[PDB]
């Protein structure tokens, strides 16, 4: 599994150990484990071979607002 900034792998034959800026969602919508965030942002991730992983990543004047340095 992968997202815009994260890649994860889950093994489906092993069970896991039991041990603000969004809608609070009071209303209804209608009416063995590997995790890495080193690679980001991700356009596309998939396997080329059994052991090769393809991770594709992304590589204008602005009004100047100086940062003070002493």
């Amino acid at each position: 599994f992968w997202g815009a900034t994260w890649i994860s792998r889950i093994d489906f034959d092993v069970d896991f150990p039991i041990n603000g800026l969004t809608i609070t969602d009071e209303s209804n919508f209608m009416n063995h484990f590997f995790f890495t965030d080193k690679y980001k942002p991700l356009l596309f991730v998939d396997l080329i071979s059994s052991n090769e992983l393809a991770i594709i990543e992304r590589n204008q004047k602005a009004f100047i607002q100086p940062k003070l340095v002493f």
Partner: protein
């Protein structure tokens, strides 16, 4: 003795050559004294350089993931 804290001994030498004068000094000894001084000047230059030194993304990359 020289050709065989040091500045105070050399500065004393530079005083000597002033006292001796141009006429008195002898050429053969002047050759030996010149060679020694040139060696010292090279050493003094060498040490000074040491003293100053003491004071002083790729498009495609191949990596192995750690799992």
């Amino acid at each position: 003795f020289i050709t065989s804290q040091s500045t105070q001994l050399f500065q004393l030498l530079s005083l000597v050559l002033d006292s001796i004068g141009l006429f008195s000094l002898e050429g053969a000894l002047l050759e030996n004294l010149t060679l020694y001084i040139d060696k010292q000047v090279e050493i003094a230059e060498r040490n000074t350089e040491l003293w100053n030194l003491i004071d002083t993304l790729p498009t495609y990359t191949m990596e192995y993931l750690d799992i």
